[PDB]
Amino acid sequence: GWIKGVLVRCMLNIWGVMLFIRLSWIVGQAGIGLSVLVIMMATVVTTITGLSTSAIATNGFVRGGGAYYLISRSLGPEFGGAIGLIFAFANAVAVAMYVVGFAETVVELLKEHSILMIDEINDIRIIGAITVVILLGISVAGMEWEAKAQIVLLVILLLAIGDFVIGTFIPLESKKPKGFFGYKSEIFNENFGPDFREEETFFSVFAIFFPAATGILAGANISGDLADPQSAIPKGTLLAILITTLVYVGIAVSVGSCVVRDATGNVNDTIVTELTNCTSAACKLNFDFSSCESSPCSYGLMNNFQVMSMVSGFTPLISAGIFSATLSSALASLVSAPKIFQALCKDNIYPAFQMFAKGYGKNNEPLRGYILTFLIALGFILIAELNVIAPIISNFFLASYALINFSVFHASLAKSPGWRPAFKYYNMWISLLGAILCCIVMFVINWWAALLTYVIVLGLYIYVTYKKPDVNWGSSTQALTYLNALQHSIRLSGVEDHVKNFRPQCLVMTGAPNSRPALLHLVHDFTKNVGLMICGHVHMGPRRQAMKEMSIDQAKYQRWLIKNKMKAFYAPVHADDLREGAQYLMQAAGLGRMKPNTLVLGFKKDWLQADMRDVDMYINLFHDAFDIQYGVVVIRLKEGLKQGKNTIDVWWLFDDGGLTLLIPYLLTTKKKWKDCKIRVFIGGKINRIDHDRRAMATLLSKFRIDFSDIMVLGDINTKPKKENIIAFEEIIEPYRLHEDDKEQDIADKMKEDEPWRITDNELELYKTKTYRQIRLNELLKEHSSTANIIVMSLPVARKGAVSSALYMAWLEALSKDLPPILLVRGNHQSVL
Amino acid sequence: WIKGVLVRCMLNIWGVMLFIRLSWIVGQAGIGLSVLVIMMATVVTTITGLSTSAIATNGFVRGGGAYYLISRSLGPEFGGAIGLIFAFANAVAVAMYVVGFAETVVELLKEHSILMIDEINDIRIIGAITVVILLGISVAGMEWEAKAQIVLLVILLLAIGDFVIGTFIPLESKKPKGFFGYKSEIFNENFGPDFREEETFFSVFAIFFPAATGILAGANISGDLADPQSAIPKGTLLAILITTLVYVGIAVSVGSCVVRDATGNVNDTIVTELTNCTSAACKLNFDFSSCESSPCSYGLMNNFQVMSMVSGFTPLISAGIFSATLSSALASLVSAPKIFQALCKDNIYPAFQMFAKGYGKNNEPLRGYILTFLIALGFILIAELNVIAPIISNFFLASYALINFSVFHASLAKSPGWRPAFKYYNMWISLLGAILCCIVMFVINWWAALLTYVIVLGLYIYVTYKKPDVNWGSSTQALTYLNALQHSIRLSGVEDHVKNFRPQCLVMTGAPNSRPALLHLVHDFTKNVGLMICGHVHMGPRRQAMKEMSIDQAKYQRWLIKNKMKAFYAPVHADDLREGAQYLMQAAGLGRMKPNTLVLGFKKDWLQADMRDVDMYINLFHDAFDIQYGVVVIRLKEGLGKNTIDVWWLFDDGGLTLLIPYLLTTKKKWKDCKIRVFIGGKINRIDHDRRAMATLLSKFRIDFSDIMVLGDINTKPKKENIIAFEEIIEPYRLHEDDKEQDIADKMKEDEPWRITDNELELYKTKTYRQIRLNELLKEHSSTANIIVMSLPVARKGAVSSALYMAWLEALSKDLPPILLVRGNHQSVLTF
Ligand SMILES: NS(=O)(=O)c1cc(C(=O)O)c(NCc2ccco2)cc1Cl
Ligand SMILES: NS(=O)(=O)c1cc(C(=O)O)c(NCc2ccco2)cc1Cl
Numbered sequence A: 001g002w003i004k005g006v007l008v009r010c011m012l013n014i015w016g017v018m019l020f021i022r023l024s025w026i027v028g029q030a031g032i033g034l035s036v037l038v039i040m041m042a043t044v045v046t047t048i049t050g051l052s053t054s055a056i057a058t059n060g061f062v063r064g065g066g067a068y069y070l071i072s073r074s075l076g077p078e079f080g081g082a083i084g085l086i087f088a089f090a091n092a093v094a095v096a097m098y099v100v101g102f103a104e105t106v107v108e109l110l111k112e113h114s115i116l117m118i119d120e121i122n123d124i125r126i127i128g129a130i131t132v133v134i135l136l137g138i139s140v141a142g143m144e145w146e147a148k149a150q151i152v153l154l155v156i157l158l159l160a161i162g163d164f165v166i167g168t169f170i171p172l173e174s175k176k177p178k179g180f181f182g183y184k185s186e187i188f189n190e191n192f193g194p195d196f197r198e199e200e201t202f203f204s205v206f207a208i209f210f211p212a213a214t215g216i217l218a219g220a221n222i223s224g225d226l227a228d229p230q231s232a233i234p235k236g237t238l239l240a241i242l243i244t245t246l247v248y249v250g251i252a253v254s255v256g257s258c259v260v261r262d263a264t265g266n267v268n269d270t271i272v273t274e275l276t277n278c279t280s281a282a283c284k285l286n287f288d289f290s291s292c293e294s295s296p297c298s299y300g301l302m303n304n305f306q307v308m309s310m311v312s313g314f315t316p317l318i319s320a321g322i323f324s325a326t327l328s329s330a331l332a333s334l335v336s337a338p339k340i341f342q343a344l345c346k347d348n349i350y351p352a353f354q355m356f357a358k359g360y361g362k363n364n365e366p367l368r369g370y371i372l373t374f375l376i377a378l379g380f381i382l383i384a385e386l387n388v389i390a391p392i393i394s395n396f397f398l399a400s401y402a403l404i405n406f407s408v409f410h411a412s413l414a415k416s417p418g419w420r421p422a423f424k425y426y427n428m429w430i431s432l433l434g435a436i437l438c439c440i441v442m443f444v445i446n447w448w449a450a451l452l453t454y455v456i457v458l459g460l461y462i463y464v465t466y467k468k469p470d471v472n473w474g475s476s477t478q479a480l481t482y483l484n485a486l487q488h489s490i491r492l493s494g495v496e497d498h499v500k501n502f503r504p505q506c507l508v509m510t511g512a513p514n515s516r517p518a519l520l521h522l523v524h525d526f527t528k529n530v531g532l533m534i535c536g537h538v539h540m541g542p543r544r545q546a547m548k549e550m551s552i553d554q555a556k557y558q559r560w561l562i563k564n565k566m567k568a569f570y571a572p573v574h575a576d577d578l579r580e581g582a583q584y585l586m587q588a589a590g591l592g593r594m595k596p597n598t599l600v601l602g603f604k605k606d607w608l609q610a611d612m613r614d615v616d617m618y619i620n621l622f623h624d625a626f627d628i629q630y631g632v633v634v635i636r637l638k639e640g641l642k643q644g645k646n647t648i649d650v651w652w653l654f655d656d657g658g659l660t661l662l663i664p665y666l667l668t669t670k671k672k673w674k675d676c677k678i679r680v681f682i683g684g685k686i687n688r689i690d691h692d693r694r695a696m697a698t699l700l701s702k703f704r705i706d707f708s709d710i711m712v713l714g715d716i717n718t719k720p721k722k723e724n725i726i727a728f729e730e731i732i733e734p735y736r737l738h739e740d741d742k743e744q745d746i747a748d749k750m751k752e753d754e755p756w757r758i759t760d761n762e763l764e765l766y767k768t769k770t771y772r773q774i775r776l777n778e779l780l781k782e783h784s785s786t787a788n789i790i791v792m793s794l795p796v797a798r799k800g801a802v803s804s805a806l807y808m809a810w811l812e813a814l815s816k817d818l819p820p821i822l823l824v825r826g827n828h829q830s831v832l
Numbered sequence B: 001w002i003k004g005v006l007v008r009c010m011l012n013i014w015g016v017m018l019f020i021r022l023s024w025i026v027g028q029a030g031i032g033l034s035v036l037v038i039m040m041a042t043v044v045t046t047i048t049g050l051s052t053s054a055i056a057t058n059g060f061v062r063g064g065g066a067y068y069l070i071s072r073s074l075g076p077e078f079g080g081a082i083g084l085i086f087a088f089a090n091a092v093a094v095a096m097y098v099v100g101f102a103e104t105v106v107e108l109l110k111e112h113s114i115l116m117i118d119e120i121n122d123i124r125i126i127g128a129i130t131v132v133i134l135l136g137i138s139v140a141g142m143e144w145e146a147k148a149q150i151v152l153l154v155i156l157l158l159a160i161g162d163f164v165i166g167t168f169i170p171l172e173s174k175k176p177k178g179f180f181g182y183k184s185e186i187f188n189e190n191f192g193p194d195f196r197e198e199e200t201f202f203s204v205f206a207i208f209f210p211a212a213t214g215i216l217a218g219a220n221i222s223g224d225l226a227d228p229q230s231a232i233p234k235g236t237l238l239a240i241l242i243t244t245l246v247y248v249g250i251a252v253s254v255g256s257c258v259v260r261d262a263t264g265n266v267n268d269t270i271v272t273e274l275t276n277c278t279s280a281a282c283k284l285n286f287d288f289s290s291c292e293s294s295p296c297s298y299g300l301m302n303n304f305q306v307m308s309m310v311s312g313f314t315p316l317i318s319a320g321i322f323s324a325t326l327s328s329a330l331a332s333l334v335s336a337p338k339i340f341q342a343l344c345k346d347n348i349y350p351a352f353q354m355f356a357k358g359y360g361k362n363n364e365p366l367r368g369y370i371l372t373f374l375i376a377l378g379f380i381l382i383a384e385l386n387v388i389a390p391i392i393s394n395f396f397l398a399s400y401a402l403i404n405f406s407v408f409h410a411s412l413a414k415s416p417g418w419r420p421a422f423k424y425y426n427m428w429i430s431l432l433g434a435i436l437c438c439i440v441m442f443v444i445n446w447w448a449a450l451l452t453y454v455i456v457l458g459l460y461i462y463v464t465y466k467k468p469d470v471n472w473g474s475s476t477q478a479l480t481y482l483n484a485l486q487h488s489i490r491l492s493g494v495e496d497h498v499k500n501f502r503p504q505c506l507v508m509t510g511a512p513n514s515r516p517a518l519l520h521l522v523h524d525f526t527k528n529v530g531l532m533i534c535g536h537v538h539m540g541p542r543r544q545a546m547k548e549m550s551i552d553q554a555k556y557q558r559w560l561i562k563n564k565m566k567a568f569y570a571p572v573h574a575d576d577l578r579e580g581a582q583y584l585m586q587a588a589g590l591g592r593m594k595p596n597t598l599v600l601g602f603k604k605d606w607l608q609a610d611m612r613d614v615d616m617y618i619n620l621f622h623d624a625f626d627i628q629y630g631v632v633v634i635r636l637k638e639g640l641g642k643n644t645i646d647v648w649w650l651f652d653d654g655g656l657t658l659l660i661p662y663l664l665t666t667k668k669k670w671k672d673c674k675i676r677v678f679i680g681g682k683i684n685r686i687d688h689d690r691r692a693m694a695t696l697l698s699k700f701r702i703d704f705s706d707i708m709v710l711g712d713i714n715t716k717p718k719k720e721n722i723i724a725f726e727e728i729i730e731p732y733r734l735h736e737d738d739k740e741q742d743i744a745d746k747m748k749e750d751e752p753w754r755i756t757d758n759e760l761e762l763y764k765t766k767t768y769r770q771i772r773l774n775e776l777l778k779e780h781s782s783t784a785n786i787i788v789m790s791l792p793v794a795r796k797g798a799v800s801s802a803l804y805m806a807w808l809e810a811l812s813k814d815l816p817p818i819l820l821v822r823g824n825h826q827s828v829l830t831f
Helices: A003-014 A023-029 A032-058 A067-073 A077-113 A120-139 A144-167 A185-190 A200-211 A217-222 A235-257 A315-346 A352-358 A369-383 A387-415 A428-444 A447-466 A479-493 A515-528 A546-563 A578-588 A612-627 A659-668 A688-702 A724-737 A744-753 A759-767 A767-783 A805-812 B002-015 B022-027 B031-057 B065-073 B076-109 B119-136 B142-167 B184-191 B200-210 B215-220 B231-257 B307-309 B315-346 B350-357 B366-380 B385-412 B426-444 B445-468 B479-493 B516-524 B545-562 B576-585 B611-626 B656-665 B684-698 B721-731 B740-752 B757-762 B762-781 B800-811
Strands: A506-509 A533-539 A567-575 A597-600 A629-638 A648-650 A676-684 A710-712 A789-793 A822-825 B505-508 B532-539 B566-571 B596-603 B628-632 B645-649 B676-679 B704-710 B786-792 B818-822
Touching: A003 A235, A003 A315, A023 A032, A023 A200, A023 A235, A032 A067, A032 A200, A032 A217, A032 A235, A032 A387, A032 A428, A067 A077, A067 A217, A067 A315, A077 A120, A077 A315, A077 A369, A077 A387, A077 A447, A120 A315, A120 A369, A144 A235, A144 A315, A185 A235, A200 A235, A200 A387, A200 A428, A217 A235, A217 A315, A217 A387, A315 A369, A352 A369, A352 A822, A387 A428, A387 A447, A387 A597, A387 B445, A428 B445, A447 B385, A447 B426, A479 B479, A506 A515, A506 A578, A515 A533, A515 A629, A515 A659, A533 A546, A533 A578, A546 A567, A546 B545, A567 A578, A567 A688, A567 B479, A567 B576, A578 A612, A578 B366, A578 B566, A578 B576, A597 A612, A612 A629, A612 A805, A648 A659, A648 A767, A648 B545, A659 A676, A659 A688, A659 A789, A659 A822, A676 A688, A688 A710, A710 B022, A710 B307, A724 A767, A724 A805, A759 A767, A767 A789, A767 A805, B002 B142, B002 B215, B002 B231, B002 B315, B022 B031, B022 B200, B022 B231, B022 B307, B031 B065, B031 B184, B031 B200, B031 B215, B031 B231, B031 B385, B031 B426, B065 B076, B065 B215, B065 B315, B065 B385, B076 B119, B076 B315, B076 B366, B076 B385, B076 B445, B119 B315, B119 B366, B119 B385, B142 B231, B142 B315, B142 B757, B184 B231, B200 B385, B200 B426, B215 B315, B307 B315, B307 B516, B315 B366, B350 B366, B385 B426, B385 B445, B426 B445, B505 B516, B516 B532, B516 B628, B532 B545, B532 B576, B532 B818, B545 B566, B566 B576, B576 B611, B596 B611, B611 B628, B611 B800, B645 B656, B645 B762, B656 B786, B656 B818, B684 B704, B721 B762, B721 B800, B757 B762, B762 B786, B762 B800
Parallel strands: A506 A533, A506 A597, A533 A567, A597 A629, A648 A676, A648 A789, A676 A710, A789 A822, B505 B532, B505 B596, B532 B566, B596 B628, B645 B676, B645 B786, B676 B704, B786 B818
Antiparallel strands: A629 A822, B628 B818
């Protein structure tokens, strides 16, 4: 593997302009020990983030290529996106940092040669604009060029830092005008001072140093391909942070022991005999610093930001090295950030940003993404001063690192993916501690900008929480949502008591979900968010071709159920007939306590023109649903289409456990039937109108129906009319067995060859039930004609007590021409 | 309803800070700043009131505990978080009110002549004694809790009436101090902001926020209302409206009545003299000099009896302070232990369970009492007032911020039980309120805010998965049930194609109490990578089936959740085992969580059992294969080199034979694996087949120890094993050649399962292969933790069930735990 390549790229990202152009003021403002402290703290947080991103790279997404899929699925759909935004924005503003550094170095280069000084902020702005022009011109195309240029340039950078540690080794009297002393002992003692002359504090110089150590995420996940991408990249990058920390400590100590804080650029201010009062760094010598305690100093350590780069020997090589380092870091940042934006746009967790992904050229680079990154980077370039801008970039890098640490901690704690340890010091608690320390430290720097950072993080969490995108868990890593669903189902199965909640769970026995859409919508009304709907389908046919047909039907009808705004589980079964497959579904479907407890059938509207064997299976389906204590709900809709305008009439005619009252109430809460007034109809005696009405009203207050009105009807149990019974017997006539007219042997033959014939004996035996059904239909047409939905208790009979033709004729006569009617019968156990 | 809970809420909110500190606050801060402080505290309290109003209007009829309301509406995690924070806030607020009462008592002693010691220590001793007497009243005060509160409210309104009457009554003795009734001349000097001795705008707000607290404690905590859905919103919100405006009124009247600098001395009664005095002190003649140059002792700044100086009949006003403070303390000491015991009974904190127990007429926690009134005395030791007040303010702000953020989070993420339907509620209002609470939480104190942030974050981390690991703790099914709904829908909506294959097992063992080791072995390779459904076919009468199935389901699910098994007990009712297994294979599971493999224990004692049962058990194999399922036949011994998991790969069945050992290895008990993969290949360059199988293994991430290629299969075994097999199958063998044709025909049609001599002659090579494989397993794999071999398979009706089970018994005769695995041709590197 190219541990060499990863090392050189991570180094070149760290070894930028903040590496060696500001450390002079870092040690001049603070001292030796305090600079060592800030370097060590930046090292601690950087190595915690390095261990975190090492845990990202080596395991959990070892096979997975690319940064963003790994950071998303190996962590969580929520956690990856925020990291992407903040770290991309941090790179975008780092571009501004490094071009400002190049610009101020160019200003210093021009100042000595130029006879006059143009506006300094304007000079920095125009030079930075030109540098970003070169940056984009390089970043249009080419990656092997940077892959070689990094190895080309790291040697020159090491030569530059060697020139720093060697320029003091050669002293010179011409170097004495500037306050230069060669590795003297007094300088280190002078510079080991904990609080110093500049008003800025410790956390200020912490911000001034911190972005230099940032950028380690580039080689771990942002880096892609480059031969071996795993199992040795973490060790190489960790070694990179370690060696950068060692060289930072070395150069800080060397510069602190090198040069005194304030200096006078003159041959004067040298005292022949003054051993007392220690005016300069060299107390007995006092070569340079005198009379500049209150006067501004031209070439001071803290007063001049770049004195170490000017007083180092062979300084043109230093000047070239500054350009090389800052341009290399700028190229790295500006090839990173736009592709980060484009990657998050392509994954489209946030469709509001999705159009930024362009892929204009042969490479997938975003042209409009390049323009947007150019604009925002130049916007931060508009601030031509580096001292206050550097904390801003520090804030977003350190915040992104804190989010990475907390994401790694949450991934280790939850371990929804594989997420092996596969690392030394893989501990999640140390990552949590690093994240907390990062949060506090980010706060201490620029409390207002920090508060805006928490605001942005909370807003990102707010957006990603309510909106669940089928991006990474949805594509190629469905194991995450599978395990979440499995864990939630196991948790649900752990509840001890089920008697508290009836929880209406429906098994809709409609074969084709695309067919009968209004009935599926009506079922979805009462089970949308209160219960489980399972749209069963019994596929009969050859068993050899059964499995492929069932699979393709599952795919197609599940796509249909998801496309329409429904929450249904398509469950297909293979059986010889309807009854066997329905038995399969009713006794076996569901997981744990997500098992259907009501059976929902559509009214068989073609029972007149269908074979009576199918009607027998329909009625026996009613009966063996009642055997398993299911609740039968029969829906008869005009399929040529529901609108809620006035009322939803409920006809409480039987105590079925309260299902026929529970379903209408669940209809009201869906905001489609919000403007619908429940008007319960009950059957009581004329003398008992007040008692029944009052008790029923209290019973609804127990169901919390909040009835509009309750009307008691004495019209039931009367002879319906001459016409309606005529129509009923005309409906019966094709299936009626006229045993009176036929001979007894002929009647027995016609009964045995077709046992579904309705006879004259049980027609007169069940006369009162038939008259009750017809009378109820008359009352429905009179009182419930203007109603959105009608709910009544469906009639039942003992198994074999009635012919199937008679039972379906009762169901047809009861619901003849009404609006959508919902005949409900429930198991006798209470639903409260 | 209104007056039942308004009295309690007004007693709670009108506390110690109404009387002694309001004058001081409107002295340090101007009247404009006092109005700003009271108004913005009112904004915070009203936002919390709308949040808790939505919480109460969430659709459950009556919840006893307000914490339990938070729990059933938002969830166990947030419910526990607000419960703990609010309980601690009430516990420390009890100490605050005790310190306030002790302050009034000690400064009344200073009003009198008797003073035992320095007033600072007198605060400590009086606070301790008052904690003792409040314990004496606290244990059982049912008549004091209900009957005395209306009297206390009457006394409090009486006291505020005397305050107004005192504002409207000038007197000569009030003239040396600051007292000028409702005049602009001192309103001019008093309007200005005059902060003194390190005081800031947020510090006076930090001590003022204790006054506007406990809006939940007054009415919502008790949970005894005629209309809990509707009276709770009107009980609190209107109370705030009848509270804070009264506050504002005082903030005006004091600012209009008493001067910012008042000399207690009677010496500086200036004669009517022509002196300018641009300061408002001499606008009316009395100078109030030398109290601003030197330390002062009166005038909204250096005294707190200035409000008592305003009001006549000062015993009545002092009784007003006493009644208000003790009523607030009594409300807090009732609120906190009840919520704390509800936390323990909800089992969110297992270590806290010892606090739950209590005895009495109504069960109350004595452990909670002793801990709260111990930490109260711990805060009594800090006698300094404006240091106690900020930490109670911070903790109440923590409770309110957590409430608002949790309500907003439940509204945002579309939580399952979220239909509040409150008259005027907005989720954005709650979010803004939580943000404002966090900001003003920080600004008043940084270390306290940091400690609160770190403790609530640690609590959130603890309740993430450590508590939902086994027992999440919610006794309400809904927050679980509907939740799984979306997740199963979250599983159903994804287009998995055939890319995602997971081991989804349908174990067929009727009694999970029997064969626990087999269930553990199945759980080993399906713990976190698939679905495991233990299925039971209940045989018996149909009439008593449902109750028997319900009892068995409850018992076996409790057993499966007690032992660390993640399984679903799925019972089906059928006449025979084959029909129930067909039910479970066809229909069990929902969405993408449907069984993919069939797990069958090896039918030991099949020699003793009737051959019809063996025939049905064998027909289970052929039914599973038809529905395209995978069959594993574990012959784990039920009595319970080095550690090794041997894999004999003799057939290409979709890689399940290799997938099962890999899933075994990624477990704690099988961490040491040393997988040895044996394969049968014809005699050739062995290394070719070895490296091809090695590449196929490296696809599976198996980390093999060695692939051994053995060609000793397909040879005649030893004669001992063959005759042993012959004696095994002898009782079930129809010797058609030995006997006559018609006896054989009678025995065949009577017993179709009899194995003929023709089946033995046809399948001689297969039988020899099975018994030779058994010899090879004994020779090569005698010492191993697990053996996994491809399952023998025959076409339907080709072999008798006796011969088939004799093959399965001969193959696995005296071996370690052996799994005979056959899979559908699906899992070709798809996992
Ligand atoms: N309401 S119905 O009688 O016309 C009806 C109709 C159907 C239906 O076929 O849609 C159905 N599904 C079972 C099935 C058979 C073939 C495919 O699915 C069930 C019923 Cl009850
Ligand atoms: N693996 S087995 O053949 O010995 C077996 C064994 C059992 C078993 O009895 O545990 C079982 N349960 C079904 C049942 C019927 C009546 C009671 O349970 C099913 C099977 Cl396949």
